[PDB]
């Protein structure tokens, strides 16, 4: 089941990036593709499905890889990228929680 | 070892001089688990992994919580063994997941 039903369509999530800051390296179209919509503060985004938030976007960052890095059990992510992809990314970062708790 | 001067059990109990009497976990249970008081609220850190714990509600086990949040702690494993750590880890498989929902 979905966390934000109003942002289920690409068109809608993509509609929120109207005043997405120019200095942010990642583009609104990659973000909307990954299910992320702009919450209207700084560069904070949320996924319409898992309600998982992401911020501090830097050059090279991949919305799909980050989605799998931080919210691996999101139904939408699995369905679009597959369990293999999620397993691989989760494979790269086994000590994520530990690293947060430093 | 993060804090060499909190190595001994006796040095650890000493930091609980200004420990609040309202917090329902005694300095004894906390010093045995490797924790010393850092002087603010009820924040404690382990002399080894430097893991920090707070918000001690009633019925909390310093050893269980050590295993819960800092399972790779050498001191925790030496005192309680890898089996205890695995058991508590299985009781909480989605720990990082529950953090990021807030
Ligand atoms: Zn998601
Ligand atoms: Zn420790």
Coordinates of N, CA, C and O in Angstrom, one line a residue, chain A residues 38-87:
Chain A
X38 N 9.6 16.6 -4.6 CA 10.1 17.7 -3.8 C 9.2 18.1 -2.7 O 8.0 18.5 -2.9
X39 N 9.6 18.0 -1.4 CA 8.7 18.4 -0.3 C 8.7 19.9 0.0 O 8.0 20.3 0.9
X40 N 9.4 20.7 -0.8 CA 9.3 22.1 -0.7 C 10.2 22.9 0.3 O 10.1 24.1 0.5
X41 N 11.1 22.1 0.9 CA 12.1 22.7 1.8 C 13.5 22.3 1.4 O 13.7 21.1 1.1
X42 N 14.4 23.2 1.3 CA 15.8 22.9 0.9 C 15.8 22.0 -0.3 O 15.1 22.2 -1.3
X43 N 16.5 20.9 -0.3 CA 16.5 19.9 -1.3 C 16.0 18.5 -0.9 O 16.3 17.5 -1.5
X44 N 15.2 18.5 0.2 CA 14.5 17.4 0.7 C 13.6 16.8 -0.3 O 12.8 17.5 -0.9
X45 N 13.6 15.5 -0.5 CA 12.7 14.7 -1.3 C 12.1 13.5 -0.5 O 12.7 13.1 0.4
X46 N 10.9 13.1 -0.9 CA 10.3 11.9 -0.3 C 9.8 11.0 -1.4 O 9.4 11.4 -2.5
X47 N 9.8 9.7 -1.2 CA 9.3 8.7 -2.1 C 7.8 8.5 -1.9 O 7.4 8.3 -0.8
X48 N 7.0 8.6 -3.0 CA 5.6 8.5 -2.9 C 5.1 7.1 -2.3 O 4.0 7.1 -1.8
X49 N 6.0 6.1 -2.3 CA 5.6 4.8 -1.8 C 6.0 4.5 -0.4 O 5.1 4.3 0.5
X50 N 7.3 4.6 -0.1 CA 7.8 4.2 1.2 C 7.9 5.4 2.2 O 8.3 5.2 3.4
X51 N 7.5 6.6 1.8 CA 7.7 7.9 2.5 C 9.1 8.1 3.0 O 9.3 8.8 4.0
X52 N 10.1 7.5 2.3 CA 11.5 7.7 2.7 C 12.1 8.9 2.1 O 12.0 9.2 0.9
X53 N 12.7 9.7 3.0 CA 13.3 11.0 2.6 C 14.7 11.0 2.3 O 15.5 10.2 3.0
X54 N 15.2 11.8 1.4 CA 16.6 12.0 1.0 C 17.0 13.4 0.8 O 16.2 14.3 0.4
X55 N 18.2 13.8 1.2 CA 18.7 15.1 1.1 C 20.2 15.2 0.8 O 20.9 14.2 0.8
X56 N 20.7 16.5 0.7 CA 22.1 16.8 0.5 C 22.6 16.1 -0.8 O 23.7 15.5 -0.8
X57 N 21.9 16.2 -1.9 CA 22.2 15.7 -3.2 C 23.5 16.3 -3.7 O 23.7 17.5 -3.8
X58 N 24.5 15.4 -4.1 CA 25.7 15.8 -4.7 C 25.9 15.3 -6.1 O 25.2 14.4 -6.5
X59 N 26.9 15.8 -6.8 CA 27.3 15.4 -8.1 C 27.5 13.9 -8.2 O 28.2 13.3 -7.3
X60 N 26.9 13.2 -9.1 CA 27.1 11.7 -9.3 C 26.1 10.9 -8.6 O 25.9 9.7 -8.9
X61 N 25.4 11.5 -7.6 CA 24.4 10.7 -6.8 C 23.3 10.1 -7.7 O 22.9 10.8 -8.6
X62 N 22.9 8.9 -7.4 CA 22.0 8.2 -8.2 C 20.7 7.9 -7.4 O 20.7 7.1 -6.5
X63 N 19.6 8.6 -7.8 CA 18.3 8.4 -7.1 C 17.9 7.0 -6.8 O 17.4 6.7 -5.8
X64 N 18.1 6.1 -7.8 CA 17.7 4.7 -7.7 C 18.7 3.9 -6.7 O 18.2 3.2 -5.8
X65 N 20.0 4.1 -6.9 CA 21.0 3.5 -5.9 C 20.8 4.0 -4.5 O 20.9 3.2 -3.6
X66 N 20.5 5.3 -4.3 CA 20.2 5.8 -3.0 C 18.9 5.3 -2.4 O 18.9 4.9 -1.2
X67 N 17.9 5.2 -3.2 CA 16.6 4.6 -2.8 C 16.8 3.2 -2.3 O 16.2 2.8 -1.2
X68 N 17.7 2.4 -3.0 CA 18.0 1.0 -2.6 C 19.0 1.0 -1.4 O 19.0 0.0 -0.6
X69 N 19.8 2.0 -1.3 CA 20.8 2.1 -0.2 C 20.0 2.3 1.2 O 20.3 1.6 2.1
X70 N 19.1 3.2 1.2 CA 18.4 3.6 2.4 C 17.0 3.0 2.7 O 16.6 2.9 3.9
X71 N 16.3 2.7 1.7 CA 15.0 2.0 1.9 C 14.7 0.8 1.0 O 13.9 0.9 0.1
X72 N 15.5 -0.3 1.3 CA 15.5 -1.5 0.4 C 14.2 -2.3 0.3 O 14.1 -3.0 -0.7
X73 N 13.3 -2.2 1.2 CA 12.1 -3.0 1.2 C 10.9 -2.2 0.7 O 9.7 -2.6 0.9
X74 N 11.1 -1.1 -0.1 CA 10.1 -0.3 -0.7 C 9.5 -1.1 -1.9 O 10.2 -1.5 -2.8
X75 N 8.2 -1.4 -1.8 CA 7.5 -2.2 -2.9 C 7.7 -1.6 -4.3 O 8.0 -2.4 -5.2
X76 N 7.6 -0.3 -4.4 CA 7.8 0.4 -5.7 C 9.2 0.2 -6.3 O 9.3 -0.2 -7.5
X77 N 10.2 0.4 -5.5 CA 11.6 0.1 -5.9 C 11.9 -1.3 -6.4 O 12.4 -1.5 -7.5
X78 N 11.5 -2.3 -5.6 CA 11.6 -3.7 -6.0 C 11.0 -3.9 -7.3 O 11.6 -4.4 -8.2
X79 N 9.7 -3.5 -7.4 CA 8.9 -3.8 -8.6 C 9.5 -3.2 -9.9 O 9.3 -3.7 -11.0
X80 N 10.2 -2.0 -9.7 CA 10.8 -1.3 -10.9 C 12.2 -1.7 -11.2 O 12.6 -1.9 -12.4
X81 N 13.0 -1.9 -10.2 CA 14.4 -2.3 -10.4 C 14.8 -3.7 -10.1 O 15.8 -4.2 -10.6
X82 N 13.9 -4.4 -9.3 CA 14.1 -5.8 -9.1 C 14.9 -6.1 -7.8 O 15.7 -5.3 -7.3
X83 N 14.8 -7.3 -7.3 CA 15.4 -7.7 -6.0 C 16.9 -7.9 -6.1 O 17.6 -7.6 -5.1
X84 N 17.3 -8.3 -7.3 CA 18.8 -8.5 -7.5 C 19.5 -7.1 -7.3 O 20.5 -7.1 -6.6
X85 N 18.9 -6.1 -7.9 CA 19.5 -4.7 -7.8 C 19.6 -4.3 -6.4 O 20.6 -3.8 -5.9
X86 N 18.5 -4.5 -5.6 CA 18.4 -4.0 -4.2 C 19.4 -4.9 -3.4 O 20.1 -4.3 -2.6
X87 N 19.5 -6.2 -3.7 CA 20.5 -7.0 -3.0 C 21.9 -6.6 -3.2 O 22.7 -6.6 -2.3

